[PDB]
């Protein structure tokens, strides 16, 4: 099976809503030890964003029921509820380490230093999925992934203000998810509102240099900004 038939298989599983095959077909494209294009980068991105996102939505549903049963004291019903929560967690982690392993070894490592768009992309991916593990982590294991998400987001932010204009939807995308990491994970609203406000104002002046993506990400920014205010 050649590289373009795999890319064909990935875009077929997308319309078929089979994002597990779409993930494996793009994992097979990455492991050919060759760069990924814009469309193939997003193919991998959308694939794993849906796979882990299914588990996130499921986990948050079981977590809510677990808190209701904890309040009621039904300790016979809760051990089935909680056993199911761990199952989805372990599934959620297996996807994330699978994504992270394909970034440190293939995608971040292969980038040339003058390729700044792909690095910030893959570094925002690194921050995103480390944040996704920190959503369900607890105690000792949590402090590790929160640091890793910080390390990936901080480096990618420093690269992004250097060689990316304010209206770039990738530069704007990390600034959004970084402030989400500051508020939802680290519990720092002032650092989260400062990062979100700065990104929105930097892009409001360079707006005619930009469009459907950036304005939407900026719409999510001020939406997050209002919710935190």
């Amino acid at each position: 099976v050649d590289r373009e038939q795999l890319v064909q298989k990935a875009r077929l599983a997308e319309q078929a809503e089979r994002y597990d095959d779409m993930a494996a077909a793009m994992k097979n494209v990455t492991e050919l030890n060759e760069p990924l294009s814009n469309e193939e980068r997003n193919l991998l991105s959308v694939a794993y964003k849906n796979v882990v996102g299914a588990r996130r939505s499921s986990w948050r549903v079981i977590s809510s029921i677990e808190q209701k049963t904890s309040a009621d004291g039904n300790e016979k019903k809760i051990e089935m509820v909680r056993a199911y929560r761990e199952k989805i967690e372990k599934e959620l982690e297996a996807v994330c380490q699978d994504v992270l392993s394909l970034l440190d070894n293939y995608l971040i490592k292969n980038c040339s230093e003058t390729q700044y768009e792909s690095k910030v992309f893959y570094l925002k991916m690194k921050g995103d999925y480390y944040r996704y593990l920190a959503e369900v982590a607890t105690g000792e294991k949590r402090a590790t992934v929160v640091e890793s998400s910080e390390k990936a987001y901080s480096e990618a932010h420093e690269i992004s203000k250097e060689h990316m204009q304010p209206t770039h939807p990738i530069r704007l995308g990390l600034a959004l998810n970084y402030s989400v990491f500051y508020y939802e994970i680290q519990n720092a609203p002032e650092q989260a509102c400062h990062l979100a406000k700065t990104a929105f104002d930097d892009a409001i002046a360079e707006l005619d240099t930009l469009y459907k993506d950036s304005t939407l990400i900026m719409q999510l920014l001020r939406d997050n900004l209002t919710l935190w205010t």
Binding site: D128, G173, L176, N177, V180, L220, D223
Partner: peptide
């Protein structure tokens, strides 16, 4: 929850 990037 908050809103992240797609």
């Amino acid at each position: 929850r908050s809103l992240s990037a797609p």
